[PDB]
Symmetry: C3
Subunit: 332 residues, 3 copies
Amino acid sequence: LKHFLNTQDWSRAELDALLTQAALFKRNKLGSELKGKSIALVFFNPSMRTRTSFELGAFQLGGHAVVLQPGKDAWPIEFNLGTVMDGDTEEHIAEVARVLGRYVDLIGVRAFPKFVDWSKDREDQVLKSFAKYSPVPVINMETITHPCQELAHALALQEHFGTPDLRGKKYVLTWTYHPKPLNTAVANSALTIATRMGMDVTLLCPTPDYILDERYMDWAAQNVAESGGSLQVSHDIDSAYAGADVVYAKSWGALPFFGNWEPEKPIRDQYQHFIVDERKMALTNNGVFSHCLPLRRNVKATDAVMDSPNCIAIDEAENRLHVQKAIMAALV
Amino acid sequence: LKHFLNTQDWSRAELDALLTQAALFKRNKLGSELKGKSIALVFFNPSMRTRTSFELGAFQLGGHAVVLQPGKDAWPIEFNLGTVMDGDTEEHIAEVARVLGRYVDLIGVRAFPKFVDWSKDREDQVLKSFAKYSPVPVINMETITHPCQELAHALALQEHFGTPDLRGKKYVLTWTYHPKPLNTAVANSALTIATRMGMDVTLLCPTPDYILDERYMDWAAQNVAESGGSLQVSHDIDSAYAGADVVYAKSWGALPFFGNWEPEKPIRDQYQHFIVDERKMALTNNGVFSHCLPLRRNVKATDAVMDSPNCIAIDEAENRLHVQKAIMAALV
Amino acid sequence: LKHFLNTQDWSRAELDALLTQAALFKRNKLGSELKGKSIALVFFNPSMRTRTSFELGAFQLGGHAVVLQPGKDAWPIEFNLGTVMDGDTEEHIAEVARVLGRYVDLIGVRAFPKFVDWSKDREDQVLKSFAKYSPVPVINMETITHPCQELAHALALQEHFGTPDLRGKKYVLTWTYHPKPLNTAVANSALTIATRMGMDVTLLCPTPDYILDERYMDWAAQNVAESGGSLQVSHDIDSAYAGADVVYAKSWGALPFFGNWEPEKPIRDQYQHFIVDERKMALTNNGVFSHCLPLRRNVKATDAVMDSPNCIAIDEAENRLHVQKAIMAALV
Ligand SMILES: CC(=O)N[C@@H](CCCN)C(=O)O
Ligand SMILES: CC(=O)N[C@@H](CCCN)C(=O)O
Ligand SMILES: CC(=O)N[C@@H](CCCN)C(=O)O
């Protein structure tokens, strides 16, 4: 059975096919690729943009999405094995996935890390459990990676540059400020897709403590070796932005501080200057800027940058609809 | 771009067209006016009747409604301008509306006042912000006015009297008791539509403190001058009910007491006798009674009045479905 | 007007027709039996499996389900009669049902007992009120009985044995352990349908305190007299399981302890050995095992029993979809 858990699991040819199908759906949004079919959108964490895009995507192709929210509509689910369920959990994931598989044709899963222990969050237990027990294809709607965002982002860039071939372009994945420590998911995904596309990627962050998990740094390294781009880590803003063709910002909590965020606060507060502003973008090669959203204005990026004609965040946002339709259509 | 924010913004001819289209949908509810189209129902405050009627209305015309609840599915949204978003708000309304506009064809918005400061609530910030930033038509699902209720009410009255011409009929908008101070929205709307229809309207309330906002009193005055009816405020129950053809009740908190409801409590408790009962209706010209619902029995109106053959509240309730379909069809 | 409140209200011929229609829908799931029709799924208590199955069932037959959750989307509803609604309740059930009846073609209701007083919970007030005031058919989505589960269960058994005639088969409805006292609904329903099908039923429970309400014990007695089976209560595990063809487990709080669960805790904790394990099933006649779900593994039943090829719980779960479609189609 084929699932859409990560772009890294798919071949370049398969990804290219998805992006092209996404482009086709953008030119003709109504169809019957999902006629009479259904997808269960399982939200362990809520998301209006994800619910909206998937729900409409199913509708437009003749299918139907069922929105489920485990944290609000049911007792906790047990994912561990060989336990005596005499605690808080009422049902095991094996039963949840097997039953859903008798009702729907696809299962989408969104489940964020708990931020107490990265060794546990990085195992992607919720998503992997659904993939293990489900008799139908599973789709990652964001856990510790955000593959749907990757393709929406990739498509937006190809559309902006007028070509699917982005090799050679200088790509800057920059950490930006936020009052709280966030999920590294979007950054892990950006690094992954940018290198898979063969761009010359620079991971710009305040200190070595903010470097992403080795797993993704390795995915990126492997992608560069295969696509012909490059991977570099930098803690210097000006040299990173210089000549950049693309600047993608995202804030995230330093991994070494999981379960110990108190001391991480004064650290991030020293880098509020990582905010994407006009000065920094002026250093780029008339590059574009984007963010996965939601974005705190004048904190992650200034109003001037956000409303600049070079900001493609709304186009990338729209593309979530098109790429997800391509993903669902491919899996059924 | 045309929106449905208030009936006052539409011409009499346009409103008449909406009501007539509503009558047509009532005679033939299934159609394709919204085939493949969608509407995002954004609830900042929940409403089962509104979600049900809009959702079914979209379905019956071949479209699809996406139900969103910002207060429960996402962090707070920022509506103010030029601020540094380092507080509770995670995303700005500009981004929320622009992205939704790339997904749906229509956006419905329900957002109640906060009851702390009327000078702030009366600005209709949430609704006006959506209207400002959305690239698609916006529909008021109740904020400080309830235009959808206005048309459902107007249609019910025309159906009851067997004519679209209600000029001359004596219309009594009466305040009624409730243990808590409520939104003036429905009353503002009733006054607006009743006068727009040229009826002889009387605003019956306990004291001058309960008179509606000047904005609506002026809308009403303007409507009478143009339609040929009349507007009058009264604090005397018997003279108001005398000869009435229509009695519409609604409870609301005295505007001068926003952010200071403690002293307003003993005041409203002195007017529990404003309850619509048989004695009062016996003074009318065999007039009809209605309420927007939900209604507390034997508090706002007695069981006898509510179950009287002259109570058309259920018919007005049904009409929410028909008028909203007319509104959505007109805006796409 | 015909409703689906309990299987006991339907004739054997009618039930047989429902089960056969369910079998037909399983062979051809897409249809137009509900084309343009709708059902309001009213959840006073949430259920992902019920929302999913009903919602998809409506969709597959050309209809649409509207999901409503009174406890989270509105103030409390008043069910009592002749009261002055100056308390917590904002709207009366008469208005709720009458209005919904102007919007939808069917109304599903799920409302659990409150566990404080069984004399009150056993009156099925919420469901009976909807049935009384609704102008459209009402469907029990679980209150103090679970008729939809009954038919899904009945169908699974017929499919397992390869025949609709289960007379003579030894049916064991066994209480099982759970750390908390639960609803007797599923057990009441199992006893009801098993006897209606003419099986030789044994109600296995720890003590006389766990015997089900007299109402259902009488339904069962009447069913046996008419179908030709038998009804027996047992507190001895081994004699009950011996030669059993079917074992259906369910945990429930002892009725005599409603509103006084403290002393019931040490009592149930003495019967953890009621867990369905391999030893017990080894005593049966190669019988099947099932549970309505959700099931706590290694508490209600061991992993070995749950994953045994003789466990049909997932098939019974799937059948909720098919039988509910048969029910909705029959009522419209
Ligand atoms: C603010 C926040 O927690 N953002 C989320 C979601 C981003 C995609 N919509 C994150 O950091 O992954
Ligand atoms: C009780 C209450 O707050 N009623 C609301 C909603 C009325 C329309 N359904 C109000 O006063 O506007
Ligand atoms: C654990 C619990 O409360 N179970 C519920 C629902 C069973 C049907 N899904 C009950 O005892 O009725």
